[PDB]
Enzyme design. Structure first.
Site, PDB file in Angstrom:
ATOM      1  N   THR B  44       0.866  -1.211   0.000  1.00 16.31           N
ATOM      2  CA  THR B  44       0.000   0.000   0.000  1.00 16.31           C
ATOM      3  C   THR B  44       0.893   1.250   0.000  1.00 16.31           C
ATOM      4  O   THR B  44       0.665   2.141  -0.826  1.00 16.31           O
ATOM      5  CB  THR B  44      -0.985  -0.013   1.179  1.00 16.31           C
ATOM      6  OG1 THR B  44      -1.674  -1.262   1.123  1.00 16.31           O
ATOM      7  CG2 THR B  44      -1.975   1.131   1.140  1.00 16.31           C
ATOM      8  N   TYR B 107     -13.164  -3.399  -1.650  1.00 11.93           N
ATOM      9  CA  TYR B 107     -14.172  -2.776  -2.550  1.00 11.93           C
ATOM     10  C   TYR B 107     -15.277  -3.769  -2.922  1.00 11.93           C
ATOM     11  O   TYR B 107     -16.451  -3.376  -2.796  1.00 11.93           O
ATOM     12  CB  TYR B 107     -13.558  -2.176  -3.823  1.00 11.93           C
ATOM     13  CG  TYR B 107     -14.598  -1.481  -4.665  1.00 11.93           C
ATOM     14  CD1 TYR B 107     -15.291  -0.394  -4.166  1.00 11.93           C
ATOM     15  CD2 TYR B 107     -14.954  -1.955  -5.910  1.00 11.93           C
ATOM     16  CE1 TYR B 107     -16.292   0.216  -4.893  1.00 11.93           C
ATOM     17  CE2 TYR B 107     -15.950  -1.350  -6.659  1.00 11.93           C
ATOM     18  CZ  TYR B 107     -16.621  -0.263  -6.143  1.00 11.93           C
ATOM     19  OH  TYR B 107     -17.613   0.331  -6.856  1.00 11.93           O
ATOM     20  N   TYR B 133      -2.720  -9.859   4.919  1.00 10.34           N
ATOM     21  CA  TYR B 133      -2.773  -8.410   5.254  1.00 10.34           C
ATOM     22  C   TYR B 133      -4.236  -8.060   5.567  1.00 10.34           C
ATOM     23  O   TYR B 133      -5.041  -7.932   4.642  1.00 10.34           O
ATOM     24  CB  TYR B 133      -2.134  -7.597   4.121  1.00 10.34           C
ATOM     25  CG  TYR B 133      -2.048  -6.104   4.319  1.00 10.34           C
ATOM     26  CD1 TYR B 133      -2.203  -5.526   5.568  1.00 10.34           C
ATOM     27  CD2 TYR B 133      -1.799  -5.258   3.248  1.00 10.34           C
ATOM     28  CE1 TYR B 133      -2.118  -4.157   5.750  1.00 10.34           C
ATOM     29  CE2 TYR B 133      -1.722  -3.882   3.411  1.00 10.34           C
ATOM     30  CZ  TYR B 133      -1.884  -3.330   4.670  1.00 10.34           C
ATOM     31  OH  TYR B 133      -1.788  -1.993   4.889  1.00 10.34           O
ATOM     32  N   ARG B 138      -9.276   0.030   5.280  1.00  6.63           N
ATOM     33  CA  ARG B 138      -9.128   0.247   3.812  1.00  6.63           C
ATOM     34  C   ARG B 138     -10.039  -0.707   3.017  1.00  6.63           C
ATOM     35  O   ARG B 138     -10.524  -0.284   1.947  1.00  6.63           O
ATOM     36  CB  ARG B 138      -7.668   0.038   3.389  1.00  6.63           C
ATOM     37  CG  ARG B 138      -6.708   1.137   3.829  1.00  6.63           C
ATOM     38  CD  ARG B 138      -5.363   1.052   3.115  1.00  6.63           C
ATOM     39  NE  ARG B 138      -4.473   2.092   3.606  1.00  6.63           N
ATOM     40  CZ  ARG B 138      -4.410   3.343   3.160  1.00  6.63           C
ATOM     41  NH1 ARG B 138      -5.177   3.754   2.167  1.00  6.63           N
ATOM     42  NH2 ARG B 138      -3.571   4.195   3.719  1.00  6.63           N
ATOM     43  N   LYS B 162      -0.016  -9.486   8.487  1.00  4.00           N
ATOM     44  CA  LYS B 162       0.202  -8.057   8.795  1.00  4.00           C
ATOM     45  C   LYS B 162      -1.102  -7.510   9.359  1.00  4.00           C
ATOM     46  O   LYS B 162      -2.083  -7.448   8.539  1.00  4.00           O
ATOM     47  CB  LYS B 162       0.604  -7.371   7.508  1.00  4.00           C
ATOM     48  CG  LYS B 162       0.854  -5.901   7.701  1.00  4.00           C
ATOM     49  CD  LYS B 162       1.245  -5.262   6.384  1.00  4.00           C
ATOM     50  CE  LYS B 162       1.397  -3.745   6.552  1.00  4.00           C
ATOM     51  NZ  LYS B 162       1.456  -3.172   5.205  1.00  4.00           N
ATOM     52  N   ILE B 204       5.585  -4.405   9.974  1.00  8.91           N
ATOM     53  CA  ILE B 204       5.683  -3.921   8.566  1.00  8.91           C
ATOM     54  C   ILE B 204       5.242  -2.461   8.623  1.00  8.91           C
ATOM     55  O   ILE B 204       4.083  -2.215   8.954  1.00  8.91           O
ATOM     56  CB  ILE B 204       4.865  -4.803   7.603  1.00  8.91           C
ATOM     57  CG1 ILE B 204       5.429  -6.228   7.594  1.00  8.91           C
ATOM     58  CG2 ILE B 204       4.813  -4.200   6.204  1.00  8.91           C
ATOM     59  CD1 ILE B 204       4.564  -7.247   6.890  1.00  8.91           C
TER      60      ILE B 204
END
Lengths: 295, 295
Positions: B44, B107, B133, B138, B162, B204
């Site tokens: 990202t 999304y 992740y 997000r 993560k 991370i």
């Protein structure tokens, strides 16, 4: 130009995971003959995120070719990548789309200045009218009314909103800030009724894929100012609207269409899956039978 | 294998908007000499979303060639398109990447079944170890512990997470359900300290791009269980952690780097922007001076 019932068309796939071009053309023919006022190819419901660039373009081309000027075509032309959004939007102009649906970027979460750059860059790269797709439940970030108003005022080219927030107070706010001439379309089937009375003139619809006739009648009743009959239609359709969102609507819509005997395969692209729970298929079946959609 | 301070590398760009390969290489050389234990190219923070497939592949290839075995490389190889994820992940494996960072699809909002098919499909198509992740702020959707535990039990090459939730109770939940051997890395600089004492072995990091030495020293202190010192480092870093996300971190990191005098241009790709509010630039400056830049 855009008003009443506008399907966010599904993209039917063959069992080999190619575009079912025949199924897609038949679907559009069927949508038009049942009363759909307009088409949105390659939007969320059309599985944009899992189409290649060339497929996206093919789906828009095929919809514009099949529409043959009978209904206006609003091409999906928006990712979280502005340069990719300009290439999709230009392709849609050059193939003869009537309008663009451009989503507020998802995942990378631009601030206000980013939204201005994104929508500005696109607005300046085409002459076609642009509809802002506001969908915070997918994008996290939400375009505020001030940003939306600024964009309408700056680019003559930015003419409307797919408003999927489901918070219809915002329809009143957007009407006042952007003017009555700003074309507000619902992106939420279950609140489309109240959305129109607050200034909406239509709905870009998931459910219209499955039930275009009764969705067209519902929107016709509203535009005739017959709100008693609009409410009778809401009571019939509300359970289908809700039942198509128990699991991902894309799988749910294709399931429904298959049960009605439309030539649409169940196939979807990962990370979407065909497999729905029995309880999910049960609630969709009951809601289809309440309206009376089986021959 | 993956522990302590692991930058999610920025992707520097030339004023002509090409990848600044020289800048990326210097950034990697610098990160490795300042004590970063690992690299994540094209995550990202690497503006994955605005890289072409070709550009994403080039950035992972270049990161792996530069690293030359000195620190392990964990290639960003996950979109919201499963077929594309597989392609990214296979390119990463063939170009010599040591592991794979795979984001929960954003999304298009897959259900549980969708996640198992996504993570399962990728796990089947590579032999590299995979790190989930989880970033609901997000992606909207959050992978729950039962799903994470199922993927770890089902696929021996799904090895870690993560965890960007910032909710460290989940680190404990993940440690018990997935076991002590499950490699947990923070995806939230601000809560990375408490993440490690709950079972984490690393971060991370966004902030490691800018202050890799102090971030490495911070992670070292925790691995040596010197928690009094780790807290002193937390107090020094916290203001820079927060100042780098007042506005989007991509712009905030590239600005900070320019201010330290690194060969990194401010250029970002739309819908992200370079321009930061005066108050934003001033808060980053004061946070950099607090860790001795003026000094």
């Amino acid at each position: 130009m855009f008003q009443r019932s506008i399907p966010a068309l599904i993209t039917p796939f063959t069992k080999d995971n190619l575009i079912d071009e025949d199924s897609f053309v038949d679907h559009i023919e069927w949508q038009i003959s049942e009363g759909s006022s307009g088409l949105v190819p390659a939007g969320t419901t059309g599985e944009s995120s899992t189409l290649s660039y060339e497929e996206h373009c093919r789906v828009v081309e095929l919809c514009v070719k099949t529409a043959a000027g009978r209904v206006p075509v609003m091409a999906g032309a928006g990712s979280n990548n502005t340069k990719e959004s300009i290439e999709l939007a230009q392709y849609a102009q050059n193939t003869g789309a009537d309008a663009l649906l451009v989503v507020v970027p998802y995942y990378n979460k631009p601030n206000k200045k980013g939204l201005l750059a994104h929508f500005g860059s696109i607005a300046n790269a085409v002459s076609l009218p642009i509809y802002i797709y506001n969908n915070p439940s997918r994008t996290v970030i939400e375009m505020d009314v001030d940003t939306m108003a600024e964009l309408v005022k700056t680019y003559s080219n930015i003419v409307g909103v797919k408003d999927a927030t489901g918070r219809i107070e915002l329809a009143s706010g957007q009407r006042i800030a952007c003017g009555s001439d700003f074309i507000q379309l619902s992106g939420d089937d279950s609140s489309a009724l109240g959305f129109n009375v607050h200034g909406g003139v239509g709905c870009i619809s998931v459910t219209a894929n499955v039930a275009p006739r009764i969705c067209a009648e519902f929107q016709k009743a509203i535009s005739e100012g017959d709100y008693r009959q609009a409410l009778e239609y809401q009571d019939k359709l509300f359970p289908l609207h809700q039942a198509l969102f128990i699991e991902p609507s894309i799988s749910s819509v294709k399931y429904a269409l298959s049960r009605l005997g439309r030539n649409v395969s169940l196939v979807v692209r990962a990370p979407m899956v065909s497999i729905l729970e029995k309880e999910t298929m049960f609630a969709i079946d009951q809601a289809l039978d309440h309206i009376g959609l089986c021959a």
